[PDB]
Amino acid sequence: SFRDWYTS
Amino acid sequence: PIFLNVLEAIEPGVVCAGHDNNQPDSFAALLSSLNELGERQLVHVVKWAKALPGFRNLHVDDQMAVIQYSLMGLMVFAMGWRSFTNVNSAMLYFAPDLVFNEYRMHKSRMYSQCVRMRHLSQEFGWLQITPQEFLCMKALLLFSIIPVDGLKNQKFFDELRMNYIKELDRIIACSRRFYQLTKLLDSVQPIARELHQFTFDLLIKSHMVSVDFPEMMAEIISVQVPKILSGKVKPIYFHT
Numbered sequence: 108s109f110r111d112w113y114t115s
Numbered sequence: 116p117i118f119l120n121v122l123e124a125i126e127p128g129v130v131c132a133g134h135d136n137n138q139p140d141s142f143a144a145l146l147s148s149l150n151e152l153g154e155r156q157l158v159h160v161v162k163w164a165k166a167l168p169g170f171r172n173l174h175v176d177d178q179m180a181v182i183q184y185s186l187m188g189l190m191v192f193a194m195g196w197r198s199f200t201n202v203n204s205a206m207l208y209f210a211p212d213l214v215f216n217e218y219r220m221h222k223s224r225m226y227s228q229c230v231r232m233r234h235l236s237q238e239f240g241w242l243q244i245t246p247q248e249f250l251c252m253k254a255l256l257l258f259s260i261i262p263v264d265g266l267k268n269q270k271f272f273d274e275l276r277m278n279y280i281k282e283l284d285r286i287i288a289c290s291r292r293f294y295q296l297t298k299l300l301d302s303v304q305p306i307a308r309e310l311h312q313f314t315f316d317l318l319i320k321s322h323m324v325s326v327d328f329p330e331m332m333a334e335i336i337s338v339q340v341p342k343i344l345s346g347k348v349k350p351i352y353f354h355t
């Protein structure tokens with residue numbers, strides 16, 4: 108979710 | 116001065132907190148805006164960092180980690196600077212709509228840390244920090260906290276840190292300026308650590324005190340910040 112938002 | 120050109124060009128602008136300055140300074144109100152401001156600043160720190168010279172050379176997972184670990188410190192250091200250049204250190208300029216005077220410092224239940232942060236702010240004027248030294252130092256803070264067991268591609272990190280230390284010397288050029296500023300950089304970490312502890316404790320007991328955390332900041336606080344508080348993830352101090 109930080110991950111999803113960062114790499115989106 | 117190519118490296119500094121870039122630092123100046125990517126530097127975030129003004130971030131407001133969205134705080135209602137007609138409600139009275141209550142713990143829950145002040146901290147709910149601080150938590151919101153924290154998310155709003157994370158957004159800008161991400162865009163900033165992705166545009167930094169060499170940052171994308173890092174493994175993607177290490178990019179994400181380094182931003183999450185160092186976020187507190189980056190925000191503290193930039194806030195100290197704002198407090199200096201805007202209000203000459205009289206109050207803590209978290210944002211244009213969230214300026215902490217003495218009373219707010221008390222109501223936030225973070226007074227001792229607040230007092231450390233305005234000391235830091237004073238240092239900016241005392242040492243006569245230049246805008247260009249501030250920027251290079253801020254960019255170093257991104258590369259100043261890492262897992263004791265290292266990152267996924269640790270060599271790319273070490274290269275990068277090394278090159279940002281060199282840029283800081285290309286800018287200083289005396290031995291004594293390096294000593295003052297490495298020392299200023301180190302003083303960020305203890306403050307960030309206390310903020311981290313305070314933020315963690317507050318999240319755990321947040322339902323009780325009516326404090327509101329944005330989702331992403333909750334995840335960060337619950338997944339990344341304990342790595343730091345449990346000693347798996349430590350600052351890279353210059354001194355002691």
Ligand SMILES: C[C@](O)(CS(=O)(=O)c1ccc(F)cc1)C(=O)Nc1ccc(C#N)c(C(F)(F)F)c1
Nearest residue numbers: 149150152153186187190191194209314332335
């Ligand atoms: C209490 C808290 O809201 C926690 S948070 O912002 O959610 C946060 C959460 C996780 C972190 F790793 C760092 C910060 C916080 O420290 N907010 C906050 C917001 C803005 C600024 C600024 N400027 C700062 C400070 F660094 F300056 F203290 C702190």
